[PDB]
Each structure stands twice: as C-alpha cells, then as structure tokens.
Amino acid sequence: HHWGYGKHNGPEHWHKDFPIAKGERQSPVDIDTHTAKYDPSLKPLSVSYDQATSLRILNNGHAFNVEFDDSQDKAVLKGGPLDGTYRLIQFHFHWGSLDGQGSEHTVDKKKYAAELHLVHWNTKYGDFGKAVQQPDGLAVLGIFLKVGSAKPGLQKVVDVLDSIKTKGKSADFTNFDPRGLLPESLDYWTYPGSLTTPPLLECVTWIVLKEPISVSSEQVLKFRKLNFNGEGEPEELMVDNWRPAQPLKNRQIKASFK
Numbered sequence: 001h002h003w004g005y006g007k008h009n010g011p012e013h014w015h016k017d018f019p020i021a022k023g024e025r026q027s028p029v030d031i032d033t034h035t036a037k038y039d040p041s042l043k044p045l046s047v048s049y050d051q052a053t054s055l056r057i058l059n060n061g062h063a064f065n066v067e068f069d070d071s072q073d074k075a076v077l078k079g080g081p082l083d084g085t086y087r088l089i090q091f092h093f094h095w096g097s098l099d100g101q102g103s104e105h106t107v108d109k110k111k112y113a114a115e116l117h118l119v120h121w122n123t124k125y126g127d128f129g130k131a132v133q134q135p136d137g138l139a140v141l142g143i144f145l146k147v148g149s150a151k152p153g154l155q156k157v158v159d160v161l162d163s164i165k166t167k168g169k170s171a172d173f174t175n176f177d178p179r180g181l182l183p184e185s186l187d188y189w190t191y192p193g194s195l196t197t198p199p200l201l202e203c204v205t206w207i208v209l210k211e212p213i214s215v216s217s218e219q220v221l222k223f224r225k226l227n228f229n230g231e232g233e234p235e236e237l238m239v240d241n242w243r244p245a246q247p248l249k250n251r252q253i254k255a256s257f258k
C-alpha cells in the first residue's frame with residue numbers, strides 16, 4: 001500500500017505516512033495574479049542549459065523523469081530569487097486524463113493540461129540528498145502546458161515513451177536539449193514551498209513561468225498511454241498524477257513582472 005494517485009492511496013491519504021503534508025509551506029498552490037506583488041528587486045532569471053547532458057528516461061510509477069549528469073556545473077539555474085547556483089538533475093511532468101486538468105499549480109484557479117518541473121539542487125549542499133534537507137536546497141522551474149500547436153522540442157520525449165510504458169522501465173536518452181521546452185518569456189511568480197510528491201519536503205523555491213508552452217493533443221495523448229503499474233500487472237493508465245492546490249497560509253507570492 002504505497003502512496004499514489006488512486007481512490008485509496010491518493011493525495012488526501014499522504015499525511016498518514018508524511019505528516020508534513022499538512023505543514024506551513026506545502027506545494028502546489030493557487031497563484032492569485034491580483035494578490036502576487038511585483039518585486040522590483042527580483043534579478044532576472046538565469047537559465048544556462050547549453051552544456052546540459054541528458055542520460056536516461058525512467059518510468060518511476062508516478063511520472064517519467066529525464067535524468068541529467070549533475071556531477072559538474074553544466075546546466076544551472078541562477079538569479080531570479082535564488083542566491084548561488086542550482087544544478088539541473090531531472091525534469092518530469094504532471095498531467096490529466098483530460099486537457100481541462102493536469103497542472104499542480106493553478107492561475108486564478110485555472111488548471112492547465114499539464115505542468116513541467118525542471119528540478120535543480122543548490123551546489124552548496126554537495127548532493128541532491130543533502131539539499132532536500134535544507135529550506136533553500138531545491139529550485140523547481142514550473143512551466144504550464146496548454147493544448148494547441150505541437151512543441152517540436154518535446155517530440156523526442158513523446159517518441160521514446162513506448163519504450164518505458166511500465167514502472168521500472170528506463171531507456172538511454174542522450175543529447176536531449178531542454179531549451180526546446182522553454183516559453184519565449186522568463187517572467188515568473190516565486191514563493192517558498194515543497195516537493196509535490198512524498199516525502200513532501202519543504203525544501204523548494206518554486207519559480208513558475210507566467211507563459212505556458214503549447215503542446216498538441218497527440219503529444220499529451222502519448223503521456224496518457226503510460227502505465228503506473230509494472231510489466232505484467234493490471235493496466236492502470238498514468239493520468240491525473242497531480243497534487244491539488246494546498247493552503248497558502250503565511251506566504252506571499254512575488255511576481256518578476258509589472
């Protein structure tokens with residue numbers, strides 16, 4: 001009886017194994033665009049992905065992860081609200097059974113078809129494991145997906161999902177350029193929060209880009225053909241792998257833009 005997204009192991013159950021699920025800085029949240037304050041002191045966000053090295057794509061039974069080589073400072077997030085350098089380790093998505101849901105963060109209660117998380121850890125703490133134990137250990141760059149025109153730089157990812165249908169399957173995934181997944185604008189909201197899956201550690205600076213990327217119906221459809229179950233188990237489609245909005249409590253969301 002492991003945590004998941006079902007009727008009996010879903011987000012309303014997580015607090016039983018992970019009490020921090022009810023804590024003071026949980027993610028995701030609703031972004032109330034009228035309440036977020038412009039902070040003219042937020043530096044521009046710095047995304048240096050030119051030297052990025054992808055290695056592998058993994059179905060972990062909750063999402064798929066594109067893993068990167070993070071043993072050197074090749075793909076880094078800096079500036080914005082961050083002090084110091086955060087190394088890309090992996091990206092993953094959350095998505096819906098239908099285009100009207102899937103995002104974890106919402107904008108004035110609006111759900112997007114999916115949400116991309118580019119996960120980075122603070123180099124000051126030496127590895128990912130130690131960073132998750134720190135209030136400023138991680139920076140997750142959240143990018144909303146809406147359904148329209150295809151995202152060409154996503155197609156390499158969509159085409160390998162056949163090879164990682166079930167939990168525990170992985171495929172070599174070298175030379176994937178994550179710059180293909182960014183929107184034009186780097187305008188963002190930022191707020192202190194948590195991992196959105198167990199163990200729900202309160203170790204994240206969230207940076208959510210205002211501007212969503214467009215993907216095609218056929219692109220998200222291929223996300224929805226993935227399985228939560230392992231090979232030779234009953235088929236449960238990997239859909240609605242998203243945690244709903246959590247109480248904002250004693251937090252301000254700042255905007256990088258007027």
Ligand SMILES: NS(=O)(=O)c1ccc(NC(=S)NCCCOc2ccccc2)cc1
Nearest residue numbers: 090117119129132140194195196197198199
């Ligand atoms: N959806 S999200 O962007 O908020 C997000 C959710 C989970 C992760 N987590 C990763 S990559 N590791 C696996 C779980 C945490 O690891 C630990 C590693 C060691 C000890 C304790 C925990 C990262 C981002």
Ligand SMILES: [Zn+2]
Nearest residue numbers: 092094117196
């Ligand atoms: Zn995530």
